[PDB]
Amino acid sequence: ANLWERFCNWVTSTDNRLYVGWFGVIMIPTLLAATICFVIAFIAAPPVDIDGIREPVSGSLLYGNNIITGAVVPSSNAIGLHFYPIWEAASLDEWLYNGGPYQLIIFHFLLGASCYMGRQWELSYRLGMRPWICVAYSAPLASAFAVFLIYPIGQGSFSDGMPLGISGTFNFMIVFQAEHNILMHPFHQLGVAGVFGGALFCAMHGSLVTSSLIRETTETESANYGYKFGQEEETYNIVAAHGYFGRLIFQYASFNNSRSLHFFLAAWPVVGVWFAALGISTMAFNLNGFNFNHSVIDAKGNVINTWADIINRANLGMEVMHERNAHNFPLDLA
Amino acid sequence: MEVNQLGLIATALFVLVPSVFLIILYVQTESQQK
């Protein structure tokens, strides 16, 4: 065939050790660009004026950070949502001061990860598989979009995007609590149910299957040798597992259908994490957690504090201290 | 940065001692009769 035809055949080959594909044609270069820029910035970038007040924050290892404190720091509040590619800067030195690497990394990463999701659909189709693994990955992907793109858009600045760093992440969490009372938001509560329940059902499933593995090995060998890649026979007794779990709770609380069981395993965390993502993405537009501050009042009108008011006091501590030189007027409105 | 001077050796051995334990066990497994 012609060059193009052979190229297409190669790009879409089910035979490549790593699947390429058309999504991969975009994913590969964008992920490589984000990864390389990230690694170099995390090691060597100079301090970045995240809040646009000429107060540069040091993110990199060579400038006095460790793995836990280091970050690629968000772009300057002076930039806002303006697009700041390298060629918009007068010099690499200016680009670095203003947090150019952050934009480069996150835009390439978001594009690349969205293509990772497409690529998962793509390969499933090449392999004659059902197509929805890519829908499960939409949950973490939605969450990355929420913290690196939707939230900054709502608030008018990439300087309020999540920093690319471990301590930076906690900074974002704490400020987010002061500003949105996220803990009191039901979508974040559903996210907690999603991740705690995902952990729970992960352990539950692991333990129930492990508990009913069919004896195929001796006491000297790992039982894992009792399963051979590609064998036709199921390797555990689901009727035994259901027999156990139906008795632990009650019969109709347990699955005896593996397909229903595995659907539940997919659905519970994916749905909870979609609500986590939508929590961040709607607090992006300042629809915030429940506010019961001073909700309980006695017969005279004295305020009777509840645990909500004690939350409020912790939130106030975060609010009054955060970005301590950046506010000149009494309300923090974004 | 004024780091703990024992950080380096603690980190080095933390990696090396169990990594070498594993490597010893892997290699002698491979050398067992095919």
């Binding site: 050790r17 790593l18 690694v39 090691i43 290892l61 060579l62 460790n66 793995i67 051979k228 890649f229 590609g230 064998q231 | 940065m1 780091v3 950080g7 380096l8 980190t11 080095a12 990696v15």
Partner: peptide, 30 residues
């Protein structure tokens, strides 16, 4: 010395990724 240590561990992990993918124990059917 700390920067060196952190980057050294990181580099070992990326190398490990490479061997774990391209020099894995190949899966064999049955």
């Amino acid at each position: 010395m700390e920067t060196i240590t952190y980057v050294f561990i990181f580099a070992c992990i990326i190398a490990l990724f490479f061997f774990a993918i391209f020099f894995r124990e190949p899966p064999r059917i049955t």
